[PDB]
Design a protein around this motif. Structure first.
Motif: not given
Length: 155
Positions: A97-103, A127-132
């Motif tokens: 994940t990047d600093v914004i939470g993006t995968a 698939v459950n990962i949420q960005d900020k």
């Protein structure tokens, strides 16, 4: 110095110069002002052979730029399927994940890179990962008008 030449050689696709510079002591993980390493730039530009050369010379497959992007992030963003596959075969973090939470899965779905989406899920993309902003790859697929792609990314 040599690190600066290595970054540009990787960006420009000069695989002979990449090898030469490494043979003469160039740091394989040299990072430019914004944190990009030669592996970042080769992945972004689509230079598969250079990706393979850097990895054979100790490159950090999970190096982070100033924004938290790994080489897998940039390959998925630019739609370079072969580089995505090689990075994963070389232990790339599929759910980084990047600093914004993006995968990486968010980025491939952003542009409708279907083959890359399948490879990421096949290699354990969550698939459950949420960005900020609360957006999963599913939600990103809906916001960016990628509907048919959202069937495989539910939840």
């Amino acid at each position: 110095d040599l690190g600066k030449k290595l970054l540009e050689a990787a960006r420009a696709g000069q695989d002979d110069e990449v090898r030469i510079l490494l043979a003469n002591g160039a740091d394989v993980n040299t990072a430019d002002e914004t944190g990009f390493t030669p592996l970042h730039l080769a992945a972004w530009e689509g230079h598969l052979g250079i990706v393979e050369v850097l990895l054979k010379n100790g490159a950090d497959v999970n190096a982070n730029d100033e924004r938290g992007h790994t080489p897998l992030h940039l390959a998925a963003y630019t739609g370079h399927l072969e580089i995505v596959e090689v990075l994963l075969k070389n232990g790339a973090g599929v759910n980084a994940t990047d600093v914004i939470g993006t995968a990486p899965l968010h980025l491939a779905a952003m542009w409708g890179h279907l083959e890359i989406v399948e490879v990421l899920l096949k290699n354990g993309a969550d698939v459950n990962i949420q960005d900020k902003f609360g957006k999963t790859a599913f939600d990103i697929s809906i916001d960016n008008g990628n509907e048919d792609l959202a069937e495989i990314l539910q939840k």
